[PDB]
């Protein structure tokens, strides 16, 4: 079994296991800030940032025809200092082609270029969307499963516990092809669950980059924080199948 796993209970500046892109920054306090925060202490608008694990992950093998099962857990907080103008856009856990660079920001969350459904994206993502774009359901925020498109195949509305820490668990079982995600707010005890069938062999390339991406709106003050406090990941690829 080909396995890979990493666990960051805290983030350390200079850690070569993580690749920071765009506005993403690791603070001295050990927090990963995906989007920029100005010196005045308020979140910056028109900011996009991503963090990728420095090594590619083997998700499926064509020779043996096996597919990896995986699980990721992370804690984040989104603080919306203002109710107006409307806060944007969110953050997302994604898997896509290796050597990927940031895509469009704003509602595309840094991983897509348009709102079209395109196989060439070869990207899977689980978003936490805070702004309702034209391709979105009216309710925000919402959890969404994105498969080669910013237009989710399935969404689940949730209530934001402003500025509080949320715990997320995303698990993929290769045997059943079920991607199930859970979001829990310890502060309020709220629990949200969402699941869908995803055939990763049909969507993703054999080796992928895994990461987190966040973005703020293009309108002045259409922003919020996208802070990550911890992140762990594990994948197991059966080397054979007899």
Residue 90: CB minimum distance to Ca ion, A? 6
Residue 158: CB minimum distance to Ca ion, A? 14
Convert residues 58-97 into a mask of x (bound to Ca ion by CB under 5 A) and - (unbound): ----------------------------------------
Q: Is 133 in the site for Ca ion (CB under 5 A)?
A: yes
Q: Is 131 in the site for Ca ion (CB under 5 A)?
A: yes
52/136 Cα distance (integer angstroms): 26
Which structure tokens are listed for 103?
Answer: 């895509």
Count residues contacting Ca ion (CB under 5 A)? 5
Q: Left, alpha or beta for 21 (phi > 0: left; psi -120 to 50: alpha)?
A: beta
Q: Is 129 in the site for Ca ion (CB under 5 A)?
A: yes
- Tell me if the bond preceding 85 is cis, omega within 30° of 0: yes
Q: Are 76 and 228 in contact (CB under 8 A)?
A: yes
Residue 237: CB minimum distance to Ca ion, A? 33
Q: Is 162 in the site for Ca ion (CB under 5 A)?
A: no
Nearer residue to Ca ion within complex by CB, 80 or 133: 133
Partner from Ca ion, Mn ion, none binding residue 75, C-beta < 5-8 Å depending on class? none
Burial of residue 210 (number of CB atoms within 10 Å: 0-12, 13-18, 19+)? buried
Partner from Ca ion, Mn ion, none binding residue 227, C-beta < 5-8 Å depending on class? none
Binding residues for Mn ion, rule: CB under 5 A, are 129, 136, 144
Residue 89: CB minimum distance to Mn ion, A? 9
Q: Is 107 in the site for Ca ion (CB under 5 A)?
A: yes
Three-state SS at 7: strand
What is the DSSP secondary-structure string of 123-156? Answer: -EEEEEE-S--TTS-S-SSEEEEEESSSS-SEEE
Buried/exposed 16-39: b ≥16 CB within 10 Å, e otherwise: eebebbbbbbbeeeebbbbbbbee
Residue 89: CB minimum distance to Ca ion, A? 5
Candidates 10-18, 61-69, 92-100, 121-129 — which segment interacts with Ca ion by CB under 5 A? 121-129
Three-state SS at 38: coil
| Footprint of Ca ion (CB under 5 A) | 107, 129, 131, 133, 136
């Amino acid at each position: 079994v080909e396995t890979i796993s990493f666990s960051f209970s805290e983030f350390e500046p200079g850690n070569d296991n993580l690749t920071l892109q765009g506005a993403s920054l690791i603070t001295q306090s050990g927090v990963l800030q995906l989007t920029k925060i100005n010196q005045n202490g308020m979140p910056a608008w028109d900011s996009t940032g991503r963090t990728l694990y420095a090594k590619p992950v083997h998700i499926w093998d064509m020779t043996t025809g096996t597919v990896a099962s995986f699980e990721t857990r992370f804690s984040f907080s989104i603080e919306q200092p203002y109710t107006r103008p409307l806060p944007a856009d969110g953050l997302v856990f994604f898997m896509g082609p290796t050597k990927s660079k940031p895509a469009q920001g704003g509602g595309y969350l840094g991983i897509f270029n348009n709102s079209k459904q395109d196989n060439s994206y070869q990207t899977l993502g689980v978003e936490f969307d805070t702004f309702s774009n034209q391709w979105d359901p009216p309710q925000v925020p919402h959890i969404g499963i994105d498969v080669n498109s910013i237009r989710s195949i399935k969404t689940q509305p949730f209530q934001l516990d402003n500025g509080q820490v949320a715990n997320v668990v995303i698990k993929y079982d290769a045997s059943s092809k079920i991607l199930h995600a859970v979001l829990v707010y310890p502060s309020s005890g709220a629990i949200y669950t969402i699941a869908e069938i995803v055939d990763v062999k049909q969507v993703l390339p054999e080796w992928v980059d895994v990461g987190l991406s966040g973005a703020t709106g293009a309108q002045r003050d259409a922003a919020e924080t996208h802070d990550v406090y911890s992140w762990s990941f594990q994948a197991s690829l059966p080397e054979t199948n007899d």
